């Protein structure tokens, strides 16, 4: 186990802080919260999406195929 | 009457003499598990306002306790100082 106080070194930082009380809990909710996950998303999209859209398809094209193989089948049989 | 709570907490420091026989409980109890080399209470006034608590200095490892029994202290007064401690305050 570790205790604070017996953590690491720490050189020349100030912290300034605010008691709850005297703060918003919901500063700028909507006005900075958007644009931010908006911000998150974008950064993230093209590592994230692809490897889905690629199930996606395969998900589609797969049932698809299962259905025209059999369903599909006759077709024609035809003498 | 804030100062009359201030003088039931005190102050002290390492080079009283008279250690665990303090009157401030506070005090006895840091003087005895060494939990602090100095601490005072205090009332700062300024027109309409003012700063009104307590400094203390030690180690790194005790600013818990230290923290923990001088808030515990104020507490016991705001809702159970008996009628002695006042006098002596």
């Known amino acids: 186990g570790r205790q604070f106080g017996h953590l690491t070194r720490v050189r020349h930082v100030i912290t300034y802080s605010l008691s709850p009380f005297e703060q918003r809990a919901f500063p700028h909710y909507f006005s900075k919260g958007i644009p931010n996950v908006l911000r998150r998303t974008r950064a993230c999209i093209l590592r994230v999406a692809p490897p889905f859209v690629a199930f996606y398809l395969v998900y589609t094209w797969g049932t698809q195929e299962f259905e025209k193989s059999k369903r599909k089948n006759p077709a024609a049989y035809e003498n | 009457?804030?100062?009359?709570?201030?003088?039931?907490?005190?102050?002290?420091?390492?080079?009283?003499?008279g250690g665990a026989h303090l009157s401030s409980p506070?005090?006895?109890?840091?003087?005895?598990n060494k939990l602090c080399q100095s601490f005072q209470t205090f009332n700062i006034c300024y027109a309409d306002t003012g700063l009104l608590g307590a400094h203390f200095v030690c180690d790194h490892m005790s600013i818990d306790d230290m923290m923990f029994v001088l808030q515990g202290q104020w507490m016991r007064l705001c809702t159970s100082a008996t009628e002695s401690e006042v006098l002596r305050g």
């Open chain 2, 1 to 17: 009457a804030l100062q009359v709570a201030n003088a039931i907490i005190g102050h002290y420091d390492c080079t009283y003499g």
């Open chain 2, 26 to 32: 506070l005090a006895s109890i840091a003087a005895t």
